Subunit: 245 residues, 3 copies
Amino acid sequence: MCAFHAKFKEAALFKRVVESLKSTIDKTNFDCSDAGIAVQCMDNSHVSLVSLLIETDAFDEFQCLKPITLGINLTHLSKILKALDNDCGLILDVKKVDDAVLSITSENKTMKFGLNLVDIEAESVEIPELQSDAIITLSSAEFLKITKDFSALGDDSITIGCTKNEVTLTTKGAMCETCMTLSAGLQIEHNKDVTASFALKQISEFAKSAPLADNVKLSLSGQAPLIMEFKGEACVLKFYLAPKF
Amino acid sequence: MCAFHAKFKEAALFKRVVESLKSTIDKTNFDCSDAGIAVQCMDNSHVSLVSLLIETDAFDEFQCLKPITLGINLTHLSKILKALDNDCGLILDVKKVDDAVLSITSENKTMKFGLNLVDIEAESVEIPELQSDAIITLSSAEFLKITKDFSALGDDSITIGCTKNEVTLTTKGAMCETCMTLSAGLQIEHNKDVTASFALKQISEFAKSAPLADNVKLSLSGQAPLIMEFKGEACVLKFYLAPKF
Amino acid sequence: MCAFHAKFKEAALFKRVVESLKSTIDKTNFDCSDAGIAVQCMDNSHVSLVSLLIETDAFDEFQCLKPITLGINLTHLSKILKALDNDCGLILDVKKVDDAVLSITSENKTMKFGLNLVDIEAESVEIPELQSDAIITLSSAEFLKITKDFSALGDDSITIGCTKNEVTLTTKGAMCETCMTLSAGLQIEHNKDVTASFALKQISEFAKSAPLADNVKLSLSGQAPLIMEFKGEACVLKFYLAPKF
């Protein structure tokens, strides 16, 4: 009997998950259980927090009787996933504790990969407590564009401000001071004006998770970590980043 | 009161201007006045002449009461312009003599950039006197293709010859002798047969200005500098290059 | 009188030939005769055999009264051919023994290139004798995709197995064991089950000849060299590769 078996409803979902993930962390544990697939760990720089939950509703078949944790090198997994089509039937299998995750594409073709698992020795982490001043919702693709321009024209920080009707995004580089202003497409749930600065490298790497969801949700606080959430079908991805001062 | 204010009819125009420009010169003065925006200077190699004139008809709004000269690093300006859409409403502002040109994109979005101006110490230049033997008009995109193939297959020179009904373009490389022949699409205003050789690096860099205009106009003389003109809507770009011997 | 004159029915044919060729060999002799254009030589690594035959049916005009051999640097020829459109009228000419092959594109444009020929001192080679166990036919583009994924995920070998109804392709890399399985699109002419390993570098370089033909034909034997054939209109390309043990 297999310790773990899972077939996705959509192969695109897990490919997109792994891209988004691998921009911010290289090796990570996938904690599987009868409740789904989870990832909670710090980014590469030990500066921020990543939180993934794929739910059982994302799969056509799902079996994980007892919890297991798969140590996964995301560079190796994306290389495998890049070989697949969004069309295919993607299946994951773990036989026992023999250290290999079997990925399977079904088509008149079938591809089977044995991915060697890794040993990841990592302290489990806990999300911070928050009560945000404003919650911003915006096209994730437009938000990505912005992070992109900012990386080119900015320095190390990006400032994000929110008022009742407008969001403001600021960076100042060596040869340029930039300011994008959005007015409510864009949704603002506001209860208190708020502005904060963040590491642009993180924001801009986080922003690349756009493929997971049409919109991105930024939960904004002046002193406590921001949340950038990409909620998909039966799946959600979140990043936690503390403001800079 | 602002020393300079300008809003383009089309944002594409100024983006295209700056690309074309920056292929042949890195930093240059933009001389603004109530007559428009002008650039007259030598290329990077001090081998040729660039001549730009954007007229006031290219703008929906234009104010420049007294002449000013903006010292502009084109590498920095293109990076800013690349962030904009051809769609947007592009505005330029100079407050006073505080050394920053404000670019503004209007969309439910607005982007404001402060570009630091530079000090450019350059002798003003004068265009040469000409009376050309033939004036050739041809798709600028087909002319670019040719410069491109020639750069790959040729050496340092390109020869351009004109007769009553045909234009001839020649380069000879280490492993190849190449010859393109065009017959009159292509227009020839001819009064005297003429052939001359030119630095291929220049021609091929000049040719990249194709986006400014559907056709390119080459004014050809045997002993005096060639003209390569890209005339847009209310705008024109010209290069002056002396033949080699 | 020209020693050799040829105009292709389709310019795409010779461009595709030269790309496919140049992936496996850099300089080679083109043996022309009244029977067509032929190339028989070992790959760069002196590990495999290339066999090309363009027939006279591939041309609208063809004259080669006496056999000639053109020593051709394929890097230089592809650079020339890349300048042409699939649309154009491609002509080859050799005047005498003056060491230049004239390529000509006819359009209101005409391009003439003189390509310097080379001296290639190579022992003529002979194809091996075969009687294959199975002959597999499959989309050449799907076969290329596979070689591509395998190069990324595999090591130095690829294993190809054939049964009555299924083909099996295996490679095992440092972090991955991969297996694609195809079932009969795909055609199998089978008389004996067969499996063999091959240098993946070769297969994957050979596979890039896909543009020549919709399908690829692999003639498979357990001990004797495999054949990978790309048969076009009036043209055919073949590679011969011995199994590894």
